[PDB]
Write a protein that binds this ligand. Structure first.
Ligand SMILES: CC(=O)N[C@@H](CC(=O)O)C(=O)NC[C@H](CC1(C(=O)N[C@@H](Cc2ccc(O)cc2)C(=O)O)CCCC1)C(=O)O
Ligand SMILES: *[C@@H]1O[C@H](CO)[C@@H](O)[C@H](O)[C@H]1NC(C)=O
Ligand SMILES: *[C@@H]1O[C@H](CO)[C@@H](O)[C@H](O)[C@H]1NC(C)=O
Ligand SMILES: *[C@@H]1O[C@H](CO)[C@@H](O)[C@H](O)[C@H]1NC(C)=O
Ligand SMILES: *[C@@H]1O[C@H](CO)[C@@H](O)[C@H](O)[C@H]1NC(C)=O
Ligand SMILES: [Zn+2]
Length: 697
């Protein structure tokens, strides 16, 4: 007969049919054709800003984590006992509620206090207050970066070393655009300041202090007028997309003489500020210390901003940026204060289940311990080798494709083949989290969790996470380190390591399964592999060589052609209007690197499936679907992205997500795919088959 009738063929067909909408013409709108069935069935949960195939698999992963973390076992090693202890302290909301804001009150004296919730702040803290010491205490002990973001990272131009970086800090709101505070941003700006006052009023109440509502509004609006200035001083993402132009190496000498700051009437000392941070880990810094400055323009515009503000004005913002994140770890009364702010940025009317939030927290701070339990329970050993093979097939397809690229000269292709051949693959999980108990126990040896003290535990993880990062300055980059835990539904690429990673969490349907049809595997995990490989060659990754160093290996002509070729995708996606975002246009520049990966990866997966058919021949067709296997390749790729957004978060993500929305990743990459238009016999100049097609890789 020629029809597959296995248990896995039937699960796939059912999932494929239930998600699609065959009453739509594939060539008019393939997103609706592949996801219409799913969109009609589902509605975004009240706790979700975004919902789709990825979000469902992640909520499903959270269930597996609940199972493994919630029941102790007598044979559990210490590394596992600590994860479960942390989980339990997090889900005991009665123990957290009984403490109110007390944990925060003990903590405020350690960060020079919060003026608005303090009395005679200038007399108490203004004496010993210096921007150097104030900013340094938040960075070094709690990893919170408020005015200058100094961090220890890998040297872009020497991937085996670490160096100190100076960069502009994050903001309270999702992006710099929000600080216009008009139209689509007004509600968020309002809830943001209201959020300040609510928290300030709860702290004063709990300290039995007098509450002057007009004094609160006055102080917290000054905080907003201040962050507006800092926000407007920051560089657009568009002006930070070239890592060559962004890397500026200086000494603390050059930095002091080229970026001075007058704060609270006192000059800023970069050596005093730096040593205030590094001394936390018994490390000394001299004025010949090398530094990488990522936001030199920001530092320049910062100088006249901070002269106009007092030490009190500055502290009210700095402490607030830390208190933002801690209120959700306090009692219900403090959690409630974040409601209007969360609704405004994410559109959610309630918070995610406590155990869901907690499971995620333990997975993010103990990724190797949790990954161990996740793979033991939910990952199959068979699949690890099948994916290794898929990566080999796709790596070669990328290399062979170089011969056919006409916008590149021979010498540049040769250098490209080098990087490709040198990409390090990481599949599933590192074996030693399951087999080396000693190494795993030692990773968390200096952590000790009290079960009735969840706030002490999160603060401990902040100190352990920042301390661990600061003592890497004089150390070599550990090559064995994975760039992701195993209990993750995603994949990644590191340019500094030239490494692609595919955690266990993403090695499941619809992406991959050793028993489902190959057409679905290539169109699923295959496309994702090519995506991660092509990240080494996008507008950002192409600037790094085979060893992870930010060095030029492109001829003047090939580089000019890359920009020329990629400019097509800039215009394509920048013309897509997103109704959920208010008919705004996508930022084709900020999303270029991801669209390059999407278009390249899909084309590379299809060629690998063609090559597979060549060797092994056709596959047994799926039941219930009047579709051939080439059409199923594109259908599964499309259903990987089924989903929708809340309008509040479409406004958030269109400015902050470097990815295109799920629907435009489908329309965009297929519009540029002739192989798609062949599989579905799309007439020329139909929406899905425009004559003008972009291509890079
Ligand atoms: C600014 C920046 O560089 N970020 C990098 C960080 C890094 O590389 O270190 C980043 O995000 N990397 C992960 C990402 C993974 C992929 C993805 O698209 N993941 C979606 C998942 C999603 C999609 C829709 C939805 O409704 C819900 C979830 C996402 O997380 O947004 C998985 C397959 C294709 C790429 C990639 O490799 O690009
Ligand atoms: C929660 O914490 C309280 C106070 O420490 C304790 O009495 C109670 O047993 C805890 N509950 C659980 C389920 O651990
Ligand atoms: C924002 O900064 C620019 C310089 O970067 C300046 O010209 C402009 O006046 C600033 N806008 C506001 C509202 O301060
Ligand atoms: C930075 O200067 C302050 C004086 O304001 C001093 O107390 C502190 O010890 C200095 N930090 C160093 C030298 O690391
Ligand atoms: C839309 O495409 C045209 C044609 O290339 C281009 O000139 C224009 O800049 C694009 N629009 C956006 C917003 O990118
Ligand atoms: Zn990507």
């Amino acid at each position: 007969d020629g029809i597959c009738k296995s248990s896995d063929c039937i699960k796939s067909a059912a999932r494929l049919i239930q998600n699609m909408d065959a009453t739509t013409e594939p060539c008019t709108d393939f997103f609706k054709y592949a996801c219409g069935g799913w969109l009609k069935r589902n509605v975004i949960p009240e706790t979700s800003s975004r919902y789709g195939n990825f979000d469902i698999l992640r909520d499903e992963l959270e269930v597996v984590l609940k199972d493994v973390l919630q029941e102790p076992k007598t044979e559990d090693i210490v590394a596992v006992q600590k994860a479960k202890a942390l989980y339990r302290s997090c889900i005991n909301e009665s123990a957290i509620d009984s403490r109110g804001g007390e944990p925060l009150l003990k903590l405020l004296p350690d960060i020079y206090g919060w003026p608005v919730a303090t009395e005679n702040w200038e007399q108490k803290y203004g004496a010993s207050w210096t921007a150097e010491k104030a900013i340094a205490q938040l960075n070094s002990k709690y990893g919170k970066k408020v005015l200058i973001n100094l961090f220890v990272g890998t040297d872009d131009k020497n991937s085996v070393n670490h160096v100190i970086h100076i960069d502009q800090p994050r903001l309270g709101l999702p992006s710099r655009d929000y600080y216009e505070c008009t139209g689509i941003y007004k509600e968020a700006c309002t809830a943001y300041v209201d959020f300040m006052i609510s928290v300030a009023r709860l702290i004063r109440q709990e300290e039995r202090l007098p509450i002057d509502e007009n004094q609160l509004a006055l102080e917290m609006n000054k905080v907003m007028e201040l962050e507006k200035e800092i926000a407007n001083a920051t560089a657009k993402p568009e002006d930070r997309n070239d890592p060559m132009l962004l890397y500026n190496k200086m000494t603390l000498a050059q930095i002091q003489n080229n970026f001075s700051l007058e704060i609270n009437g006192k000059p800023f000392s970069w050596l005093n500020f730096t040593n205030e941070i590094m001394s936390t880990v018994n490390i000394s810094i001299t004025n010949e210390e090398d530094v990488v400055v990522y936001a030199p323009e920001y530092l320049t515009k910062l100088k006249p901003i901070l002269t106009k503000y007092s030490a009190r004005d500055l502290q009210n913002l700095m402490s607030w940026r830390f208190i933002m994140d801690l209120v959700s770890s306090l009692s219900r009364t403090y959690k409630e204060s974040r409601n209007a702010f969360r609704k405004a940025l994410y559109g959610t009317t309630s918070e995610t289940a406590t155990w869901r939030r907690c499971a995620n927290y333990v997975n993010g701070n103990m990724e190797n311990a949790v990954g161990r339990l996740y793979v033991e329970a939910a990952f199959a050993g068979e699949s690890k080798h099948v994916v290794e093979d898929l990566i080999a097939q796709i790596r070669e397809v990328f290399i062979q494709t170089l011969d056919d690229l006409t916008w590149m000269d021979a010498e540049t292709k040769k250098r490209a083949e080098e990087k490709a051949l040198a990409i390090k693959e990481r599949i599933g999980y590192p074996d030693d989290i399951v087999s080396n108990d000693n190494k795993l126990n030692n990773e968390y040896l200096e952590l000790n969790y009290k079960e009735d003290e969840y706030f002490e535990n999160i603060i401990q993880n902040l100190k352990f996470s920042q301390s661990k990062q600061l003592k890497k300055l004089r150390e070599k980059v550990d090559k064995d380190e994975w760039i992701s835990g195993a209990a993750v539904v995603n994949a990644f690429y590191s340019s500094g390591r030239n490494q692609i990673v595919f955690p266990a969490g993403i090695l499941q349907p619809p992406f991959f399964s050793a028993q489902q049809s190959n057409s679905l595997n290539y169109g699923g995990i295959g496309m994702v592999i090519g995506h991660e490989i092509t990240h080494g060659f996008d507008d950002n990754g192409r600037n790094f060589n085979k060893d992870g160093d930010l060095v030029d290996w492109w001829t003047q002509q090939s580089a000019s052609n890359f920009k020329e070729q990629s400019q097509c995708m800039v215009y394509q996606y920048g013309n897509f209007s997103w109704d959920l975002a208010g008919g705004q246009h996508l930022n084709g520049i900020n999303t270029l690197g991801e669209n390059i990966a999407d278009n390249g990866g899909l084309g590379q997966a299809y060629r690998a499936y063609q090559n597979y058919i060549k060797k092994n021949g056709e596959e047994k067709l799926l039941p219930g679907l009047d579709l051939n296997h080439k059409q199923l390749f594109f259908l599964n790729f499309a259903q990987v992205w089924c989903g929708t957004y809340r309008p509040e978060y479409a406004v958030n993500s269109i400015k902050t997500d470097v990815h295109s929305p799920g629907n435009f990743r489908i329309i965009g990459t297929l519009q540029n795919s002739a192989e798609f238009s062949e599989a579905f016999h799309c007439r020329k100049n139909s929406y899905m088959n425009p004559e003008k097609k972009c291509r890079v890789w």
